[PDB]
Amino acid sequence: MDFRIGQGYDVHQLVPGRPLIIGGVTIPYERGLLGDADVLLHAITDALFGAAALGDIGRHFSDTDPRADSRALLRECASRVAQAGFAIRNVDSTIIAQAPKLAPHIDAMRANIAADLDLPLDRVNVKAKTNEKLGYLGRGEGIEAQAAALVVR
Amino acid sequence: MDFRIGQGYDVHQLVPGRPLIIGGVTIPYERGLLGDADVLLHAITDALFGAAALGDIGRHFDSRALLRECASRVAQAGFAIRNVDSTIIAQAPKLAPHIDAMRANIAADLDLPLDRVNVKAKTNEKLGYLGRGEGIEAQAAALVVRE
Amino acid sequence: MDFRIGQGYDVHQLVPGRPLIIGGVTIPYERGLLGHSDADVLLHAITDALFGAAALGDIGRHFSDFKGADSRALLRECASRVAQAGFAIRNVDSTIIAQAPKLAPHIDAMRANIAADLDLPLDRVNVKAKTNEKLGYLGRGEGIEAQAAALVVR
Numbered sequence: 001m002d003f004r005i006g007q008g009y010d011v012h013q014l015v016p017g018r019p020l021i022i023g024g025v026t027i028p029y030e031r032g033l034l035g036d037a038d039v040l041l042h043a044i045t046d047a048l049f050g051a052a053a054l055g056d057i058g059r060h061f062s063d064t065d066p067r068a069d070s071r072a073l074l075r076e077c078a079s080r081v082a083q084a085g086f087a088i089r090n091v092d093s094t095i096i097a098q099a100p101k102l103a104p105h106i107d108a109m110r111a112n113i114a115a116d117l118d119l120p121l122d123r124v125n126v127k128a129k130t131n132e133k134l135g136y137l138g139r140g141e142g143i144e145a146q147a148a149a150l151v152v153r
Numbered sequence: 154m155d156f157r158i159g160q161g162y163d164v165h166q167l168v169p170g171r172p173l174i175i176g177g178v179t180i181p182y183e184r185g186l187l188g189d190a191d192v193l194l195h196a197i198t199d200a201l202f203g204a205a206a207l208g209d210i211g212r213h214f215d216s217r218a219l220l221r222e223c224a225s226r227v228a229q230a231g232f233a234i235r236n237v238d239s240t241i242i243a244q245a246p247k248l249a250p251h252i253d254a255m256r257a258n259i260a261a262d263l264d265l266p267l268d269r270v271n272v273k274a275k276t277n278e279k280l281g282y283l284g285r286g287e288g289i290e291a292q293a294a295a296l297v298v299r300e
Numbered sequence: 301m302d303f304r305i306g307q308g309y310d311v312h313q314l315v316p317g318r319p320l321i322i323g324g325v326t327i328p329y330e331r332g333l334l335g336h337s338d339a340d341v342l343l344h345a346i347t348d349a350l351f352g353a354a355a356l357g358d359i360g361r362h363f364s365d366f367k368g369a370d371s372r373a374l375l376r377e378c379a380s381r382v383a384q385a386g387f388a389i390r391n392v393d394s395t396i397i398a399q400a401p402k403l404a405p406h407i408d409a410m411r412a413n414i415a416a417d418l419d420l421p422l423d424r425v426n427v428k429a430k431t432n433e434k435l436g437y438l439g440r441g442e443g444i445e446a447q448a449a450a451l452v453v454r
């Protein structure tokens with residue numbers, strides 16, 4: 001039927017003094033993202049609004065708007081996607097971070113995302129990459145996330 | 154039915170004495186893209202050629218005329234365009250007031266209704282060449298179907 | 301009707317003294333990609349996109365970083381696991397970003413390798429090449445990046 005695709009990007013700086021929260025999971029580390037600055041949840045939200053052609057995360061959830069962590073935002077995104085007429089079919093994503101090791105936390109992130117989107121676990125995927133010591137990502141100065149989402153009207 | 158996906162990437166340097174044109178919209182700014190170097194339309198063009206497996210922009214070829222030709226070639230290969238999504242990564246200037254016009258431009262060029270075309274914008278949080286405003290990146294995804 | 305999408309990203313450093321192998325093609329060049337396998341950045345990105353579309357995690361889960369491993373053999377194994385999970389591949393698209401060397405003379409060969417490894421006809425596989433317009437570590441030729449997207453159906 002009426003399938004649509006969306007894609008999402010996000011990046012935040014990595015500094016001492018903030019906790020590291022990615023995909024709703026708090027990961028012990030000497031440093032955290034500046035923004036809860038959940039780079040993975042933001043990229044996924046963008047991908048979803050994109051698939052539904054609803055603009056972007058900033059247009060829905062403004063820095064200034066009096067009307068929240070990134071999971072609340074993800075859930076509101078999904079309701080808006082639903083109300084627009086679209087059912088979510090799957091999400092895939094990649095986190096690019098030189099450190100720390102993310103593999104142990106992947107199932108936790110998938111579980112949070114699946115819960116927030118009301119999806120079966122087998123329709124949510126999260127992957128992790130280093131940047132092979134290249135650029136600001138490779139130097140541990142920031143963390144990037146990429147997302148793809150498929151929906152149907 | 155026979156769906157296919159494509160993905161596109163483009164980046165251009167920001168330089169003095171060039172108009173800034175993105176998604177076919179002229180945006181007032183001290184610099185512009187070097188190449189009309191419309192990074193957004195180029196990424197979308199590559200995503201569409203990718204979905205139709207027709208190669209890339211460099212193997213085929215202003216950017217709106219090129220986007221129209223791309224759409225022509227896609228249809229010539231037997232595909233219909235179902236939707237486009239995209240992200241512009243620019244530290245500056247503010248793109249928000251220009252986005253709906255970009256969507257309208259793309260929709261017109263692809264012969265698509267507005268609700269099948271999306272454009273999003275992000276800064277780079279002051280990181281890398283994007284963060285320093287040395288260039289602007291675009292990413293695109295397209296879904297087509299062979300009927 | 302049960303379609304799924306996946307996306308993939310990879311980057312490797314370019315160093316002297318290594319073969320340059322992208323899309324399974326050995327490309328004449330004074331530097332090659334550094335990695336534990338043959339460091340084929342394009343095949344790895346595609347492999348990740350396919351595992352991602354099937355929700356089977358990532359290339360590191362399946363093939364733990366394989367010393368000098370042929371990344372085409374890895375791609376074929378990935379395709380096998382994707383099929384075993386119940387998915388057929390419908391198409392792959394990809395972009396390589398590199399300052400140098402010129403990739404255009406090798407693109408059709410890369411496409412042919414990928415099609416062979418995924419048992420797809422050529423018309424469902426696409427490879428695009430881009431410079432990074434002189435920007436950043438890619439612009440300085442310090443590494444090569446690949447991006448991929450895949451559509452599958454269960």
Ligand SMILES: Nc1ccn([C@@H]2O[C@H](CI)[C@@H](O)[C@H]2O)c(=O)n1
Nearest residue numbers: 058059243247248249274275276
């Ligand atoms: N150069 C930019 C970057 C981002 N935005 C908008 O500002 C928000 C902040 I991420 C998003 O809604 C985005 O659309 C913008 O208007 N101009």
Ligand SMILES: Nc1ccn([C@@H]2O[C@H](CI)[C@@H](O)[C@H]2O)c(=O)n1
Nearest residue numbers: 211212398402403404429430431
């Ligand atoms: N390293 C590169 C980068 C780009 N190109 C080709 O040159 C054109 C110019 I963007 C594109 O079509 C692309 O296929 C190439 O042959 N080698």
Ligand SMILES: Nc1ccn([C@@H]2O[C@H](CI)[C@@H](O)[C@H]2O)c(=O)n1
Nearest residue numbers: 097100101102103128129130360
């Ligand atoms: N920050 C990171 C980066 C990567 N990995 C895992 O390590 C492998 C080496 I690229 C990746 O494919 C992924 O499986 C990880 O656990 N944490």
Ligand SMILES: [Cl-]
Nearest residue numbers: 432433434439
């Ligand atoms: Cl370059």
Ligand SMILES: [K+]
Nearest residue numbers: 144290309445
């Ligand atoms: K990038």
Ligand SMILES: [Zn+2]
Nearest residue numbers: 010038039042
């Ligand atoms: Zn964010």
Ligand SMILES: [Zn+2]
Nearest residue numbers: 163191192195
């Ligand atoms: Zn361009």
Ligand SMILES: [Zn+2]
Nearest residue numbers: 310340341344
């Ligand atoms: Zn690799």
